[PDB]
Short mmCIF file of C-alpha atoms and ligand atoms in Angstrom, two decimals:
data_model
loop_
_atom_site.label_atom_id
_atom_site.label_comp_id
_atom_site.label_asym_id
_atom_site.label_seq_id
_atom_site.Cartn_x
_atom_site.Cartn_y
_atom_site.Cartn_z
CA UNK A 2 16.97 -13.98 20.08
CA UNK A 3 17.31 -13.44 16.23
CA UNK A 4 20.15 -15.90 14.58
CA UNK A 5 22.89 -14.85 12.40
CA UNK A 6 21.43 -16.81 10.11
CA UNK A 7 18.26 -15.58 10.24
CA UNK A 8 19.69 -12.19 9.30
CA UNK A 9 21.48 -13.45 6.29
CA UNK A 10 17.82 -15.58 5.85
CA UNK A 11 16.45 -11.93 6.33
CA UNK A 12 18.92 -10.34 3.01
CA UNK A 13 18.22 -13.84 0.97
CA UNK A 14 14.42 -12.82 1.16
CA UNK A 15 15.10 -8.89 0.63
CA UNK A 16 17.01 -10.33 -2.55
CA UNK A 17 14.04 -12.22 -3.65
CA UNK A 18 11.52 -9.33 -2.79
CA UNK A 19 13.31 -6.64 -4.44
CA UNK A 20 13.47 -9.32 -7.24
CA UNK A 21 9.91 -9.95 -8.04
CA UNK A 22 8.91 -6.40 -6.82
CA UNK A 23 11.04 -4.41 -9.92
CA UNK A 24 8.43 -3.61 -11.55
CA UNK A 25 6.03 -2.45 -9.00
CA UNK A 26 8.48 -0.08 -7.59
CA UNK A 27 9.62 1.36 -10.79
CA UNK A 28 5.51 1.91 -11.11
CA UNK A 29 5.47 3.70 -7.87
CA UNK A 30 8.84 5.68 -8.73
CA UNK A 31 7.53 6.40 -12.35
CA UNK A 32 4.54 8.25 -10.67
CA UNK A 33 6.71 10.45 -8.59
CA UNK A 34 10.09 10.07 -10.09
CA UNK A 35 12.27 9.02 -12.54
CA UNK A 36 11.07 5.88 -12.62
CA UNK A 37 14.20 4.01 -11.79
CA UNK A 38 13.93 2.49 -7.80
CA UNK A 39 12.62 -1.14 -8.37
CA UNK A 40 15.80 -1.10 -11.02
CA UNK A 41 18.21 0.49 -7.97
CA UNK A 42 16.77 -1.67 -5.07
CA UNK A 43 17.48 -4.94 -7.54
CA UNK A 44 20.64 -3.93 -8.53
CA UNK A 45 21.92 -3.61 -4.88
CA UNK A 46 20.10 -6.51 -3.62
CA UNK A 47 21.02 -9.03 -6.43
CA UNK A 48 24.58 -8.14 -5.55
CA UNK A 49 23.84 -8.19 -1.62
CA UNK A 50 22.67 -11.41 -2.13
CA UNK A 51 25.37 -13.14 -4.82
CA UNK A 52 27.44 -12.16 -1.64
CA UNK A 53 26.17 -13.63 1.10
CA UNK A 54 28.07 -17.46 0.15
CA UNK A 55 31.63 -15.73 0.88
CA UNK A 56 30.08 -14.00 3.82
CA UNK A 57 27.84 -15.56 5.41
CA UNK A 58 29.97 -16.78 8.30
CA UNK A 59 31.85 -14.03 9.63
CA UNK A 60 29.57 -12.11 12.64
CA UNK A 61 26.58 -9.82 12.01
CA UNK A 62 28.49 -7.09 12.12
CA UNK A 63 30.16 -8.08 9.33
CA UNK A 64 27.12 -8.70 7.53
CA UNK A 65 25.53 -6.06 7.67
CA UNK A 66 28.32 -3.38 7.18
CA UNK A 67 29.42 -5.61 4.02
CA UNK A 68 25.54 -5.11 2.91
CA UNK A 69 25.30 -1.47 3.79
CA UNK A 70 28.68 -0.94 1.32
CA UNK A 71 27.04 -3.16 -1.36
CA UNK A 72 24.14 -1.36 -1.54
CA UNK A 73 26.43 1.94 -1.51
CA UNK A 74 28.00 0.97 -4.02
CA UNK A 75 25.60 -0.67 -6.16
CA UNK A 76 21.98 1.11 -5.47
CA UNK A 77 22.50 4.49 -6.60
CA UNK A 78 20.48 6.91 -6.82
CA UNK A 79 19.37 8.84 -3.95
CA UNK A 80 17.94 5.62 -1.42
CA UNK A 81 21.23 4.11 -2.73
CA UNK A 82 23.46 6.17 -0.15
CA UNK A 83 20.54 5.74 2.29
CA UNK A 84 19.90 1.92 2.64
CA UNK A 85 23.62 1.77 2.57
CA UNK A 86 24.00 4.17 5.40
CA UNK A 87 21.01 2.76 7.13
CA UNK A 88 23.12 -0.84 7.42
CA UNK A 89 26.68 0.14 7.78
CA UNK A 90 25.07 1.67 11.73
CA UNK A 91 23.36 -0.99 11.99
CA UNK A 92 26.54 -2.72 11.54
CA UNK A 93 28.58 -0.83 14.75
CA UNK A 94 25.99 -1.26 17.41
CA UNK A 95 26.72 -4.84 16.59
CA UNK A 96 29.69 -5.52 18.72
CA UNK A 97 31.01 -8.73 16.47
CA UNK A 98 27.88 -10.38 17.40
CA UNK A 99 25.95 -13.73 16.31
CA UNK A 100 22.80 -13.34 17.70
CA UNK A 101 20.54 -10.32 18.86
CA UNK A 102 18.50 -9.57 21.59
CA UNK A 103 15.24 -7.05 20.82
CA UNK A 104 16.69 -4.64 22.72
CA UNK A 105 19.59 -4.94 20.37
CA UNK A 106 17.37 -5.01 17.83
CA UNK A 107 15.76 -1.58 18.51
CA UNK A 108 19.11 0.01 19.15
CA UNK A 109 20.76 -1.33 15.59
CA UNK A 110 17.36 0.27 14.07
CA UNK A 111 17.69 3.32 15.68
CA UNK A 112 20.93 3.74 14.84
CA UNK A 113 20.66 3.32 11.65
CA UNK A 114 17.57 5.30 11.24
CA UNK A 115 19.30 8.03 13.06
CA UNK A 116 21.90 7.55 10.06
CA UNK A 117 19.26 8.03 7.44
CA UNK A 118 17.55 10.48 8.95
CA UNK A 119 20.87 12.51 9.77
CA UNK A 120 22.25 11.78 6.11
CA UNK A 121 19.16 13.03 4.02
CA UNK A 122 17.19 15.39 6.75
CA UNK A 123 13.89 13.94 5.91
CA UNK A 124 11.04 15.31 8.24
CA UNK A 125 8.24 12.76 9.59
CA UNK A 126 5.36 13.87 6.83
CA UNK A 127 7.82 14.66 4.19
CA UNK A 128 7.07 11.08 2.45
CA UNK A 129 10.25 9.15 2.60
CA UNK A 130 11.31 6.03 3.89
CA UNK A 131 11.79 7.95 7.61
CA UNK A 132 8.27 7.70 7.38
CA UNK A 133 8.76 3.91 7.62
CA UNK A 134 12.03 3.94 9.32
CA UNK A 135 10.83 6.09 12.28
CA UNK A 136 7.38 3.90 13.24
CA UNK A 137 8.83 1.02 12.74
CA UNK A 138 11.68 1.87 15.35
CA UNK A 139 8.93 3.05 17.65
CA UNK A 140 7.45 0.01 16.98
CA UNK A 141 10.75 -2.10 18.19
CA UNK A 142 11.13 0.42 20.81
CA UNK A 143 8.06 -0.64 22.74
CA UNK A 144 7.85 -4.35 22.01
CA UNK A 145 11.66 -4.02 23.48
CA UNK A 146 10.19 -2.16 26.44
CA UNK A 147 7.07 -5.30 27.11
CA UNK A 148 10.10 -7.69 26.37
CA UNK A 149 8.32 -9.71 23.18
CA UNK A 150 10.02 -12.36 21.54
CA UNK A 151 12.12 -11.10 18.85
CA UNK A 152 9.66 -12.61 16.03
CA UNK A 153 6.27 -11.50 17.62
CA UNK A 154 8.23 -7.77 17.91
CA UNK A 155 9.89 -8.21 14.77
CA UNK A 156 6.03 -9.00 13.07
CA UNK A 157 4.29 -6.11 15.02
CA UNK A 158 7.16 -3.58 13.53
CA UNK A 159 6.00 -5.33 10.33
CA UNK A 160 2.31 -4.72 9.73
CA UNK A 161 3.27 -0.86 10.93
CA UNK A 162 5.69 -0.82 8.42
CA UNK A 163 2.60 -1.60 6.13
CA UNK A 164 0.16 1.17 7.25
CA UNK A 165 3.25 3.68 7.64
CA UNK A 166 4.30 2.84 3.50
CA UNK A 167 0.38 3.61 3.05
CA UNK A 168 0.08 6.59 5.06
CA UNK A 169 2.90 7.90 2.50
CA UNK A 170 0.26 7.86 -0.38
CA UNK A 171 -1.16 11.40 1.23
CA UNK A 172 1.54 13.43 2.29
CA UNK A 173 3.10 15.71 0.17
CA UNK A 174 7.11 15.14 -0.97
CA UNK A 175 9.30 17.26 1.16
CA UNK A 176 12.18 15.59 -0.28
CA UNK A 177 13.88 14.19 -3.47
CA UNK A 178 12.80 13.85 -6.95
CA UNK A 179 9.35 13.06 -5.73
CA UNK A 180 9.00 17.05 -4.73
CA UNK A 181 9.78 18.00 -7.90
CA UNK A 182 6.23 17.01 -8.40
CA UNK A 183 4.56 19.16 -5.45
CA UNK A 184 1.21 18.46 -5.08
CA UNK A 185 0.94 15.80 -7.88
CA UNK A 186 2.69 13.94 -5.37
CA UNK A 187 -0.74 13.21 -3.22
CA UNK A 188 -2.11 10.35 -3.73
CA UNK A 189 1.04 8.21 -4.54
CA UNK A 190 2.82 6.00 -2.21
CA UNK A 191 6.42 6.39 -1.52
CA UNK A 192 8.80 3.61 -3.10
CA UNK A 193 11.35 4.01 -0.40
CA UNK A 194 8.79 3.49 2.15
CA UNK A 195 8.15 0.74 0.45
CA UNK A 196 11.03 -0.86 0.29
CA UNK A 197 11.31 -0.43 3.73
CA UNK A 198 8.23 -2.27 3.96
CA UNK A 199 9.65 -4.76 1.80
CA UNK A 200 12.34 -5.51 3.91
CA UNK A 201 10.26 -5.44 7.16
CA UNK A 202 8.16 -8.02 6.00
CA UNK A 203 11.17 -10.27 4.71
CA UNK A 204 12.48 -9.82 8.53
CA UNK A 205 9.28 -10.65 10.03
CA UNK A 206 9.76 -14.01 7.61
CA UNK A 207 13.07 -15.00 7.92
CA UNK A 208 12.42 -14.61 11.74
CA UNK A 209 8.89 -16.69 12.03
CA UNK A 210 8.97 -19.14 14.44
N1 LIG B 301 16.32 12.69 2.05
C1 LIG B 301 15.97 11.98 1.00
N2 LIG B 301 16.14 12.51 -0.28
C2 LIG B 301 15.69 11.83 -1.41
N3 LIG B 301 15.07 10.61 -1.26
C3 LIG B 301 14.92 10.12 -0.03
C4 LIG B 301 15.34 10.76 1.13
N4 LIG B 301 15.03 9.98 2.22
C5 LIG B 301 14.41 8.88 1.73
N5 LIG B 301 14.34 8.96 0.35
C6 LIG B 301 13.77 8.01 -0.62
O1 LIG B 301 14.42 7.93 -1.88
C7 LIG B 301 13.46 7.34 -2.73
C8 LIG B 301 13.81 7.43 -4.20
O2 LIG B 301 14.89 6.57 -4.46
P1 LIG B 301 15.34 6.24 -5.97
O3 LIG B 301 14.19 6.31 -6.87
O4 LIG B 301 16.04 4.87 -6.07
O5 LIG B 301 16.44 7.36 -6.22
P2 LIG B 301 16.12 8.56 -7.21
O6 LIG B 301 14.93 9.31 -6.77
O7 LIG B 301 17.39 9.43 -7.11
O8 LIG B 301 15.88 8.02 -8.63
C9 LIG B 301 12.19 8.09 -2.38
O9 LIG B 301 11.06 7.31 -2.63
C10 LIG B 301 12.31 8.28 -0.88
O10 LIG B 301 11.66 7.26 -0.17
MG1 LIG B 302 13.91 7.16 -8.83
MG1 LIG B 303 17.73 8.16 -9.80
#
């Protein structure tokens, strides 16, 4: 099962990540953007995060839909509206919760990758964070289906979440600022995928045994 307070440990870390990562995913978002995402994801997470003391004992649900609006309000941009979307379903699918099963897991993922993916229409291949987001629930979707352990699922959905981030750094932007460029986007990684990655790897953490 993953605690309540393992999720808030989860946005604590994401707060921390998206801290120390600024600059290294305004880099990526200079390259093929406006250079502005490691600025957006630290906004929204520093606020997230100055948060969590009021919040962090009401129910997941509660959490998480308080996060999503956070980072809607506070991101900006165009992953701004995303992340935010991404955890306010991930929110309802949490029936006033305070633990999660995997399977629960998987479907509070889906559902809010199904909210991304319905909100900005990004195509697998068209190098957004989908390109994370959709793996990564595949990846949850099987480890659900061999019945893993929450943190042995939650660390397999987070080394794909590394090679899908890298795989970004060949396809061509579909989508957002970043196809603007065209074909000068090759060779550049995604910084939504990598946040994405970012915050895969602080929920592998903040779940570790
Ligand atoms: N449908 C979408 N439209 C635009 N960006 C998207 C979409 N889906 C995911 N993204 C992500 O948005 C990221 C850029 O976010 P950010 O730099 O903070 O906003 P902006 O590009 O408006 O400055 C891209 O790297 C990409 O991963
Ligand atoms: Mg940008
Ligand atoms: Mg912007």
């Amino acid at each position: 099962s993953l605690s309540r307070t393992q999720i808030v440990n989860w946005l604590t870390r994401c707060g921390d990540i998206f801290s120390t990562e600024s600059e290294y995913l305004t880099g990526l978002d200079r390259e093929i953007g406006d250079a502005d995402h490691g600025l957006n994801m630290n906004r929204g997470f520093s606020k997230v995060v100055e948060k969590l003391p009021a919040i962090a004992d009401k129910d997941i649900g509660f959490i998480l839909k308080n996060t999503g609006m956070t980072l809607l309000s506070s991101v900006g941009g165009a992953s701004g509206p995303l992340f935010g979307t991404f955890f306010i379903r991930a929110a309802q699918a949490t029936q006033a919760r305070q633990s999660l099963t995997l399977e629960e897991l998987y479907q509070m993922f889906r559902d809010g990758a199904d909210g991304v993916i319905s909100r900005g229409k990004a195509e697998p291949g068209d190098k957004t964070m989908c390109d994370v987001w959709v793996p990564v629930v595949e990846s949850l979707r099987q480890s659900s289906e061999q019945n893993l352990s929450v943190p042995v699922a939650l660390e397999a959905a987070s080394s794909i979440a590394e090679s899908a981030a890298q795989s970004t750094i060949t396809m061509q932007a579909r989508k957002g600022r970043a196809s603007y460029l065209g074909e000068r986007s090759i060779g550049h990684q995604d910084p939504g995928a990598t946040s994405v990655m970012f915050m895969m790897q602080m929920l592998a953490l903040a779940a570790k045994e």
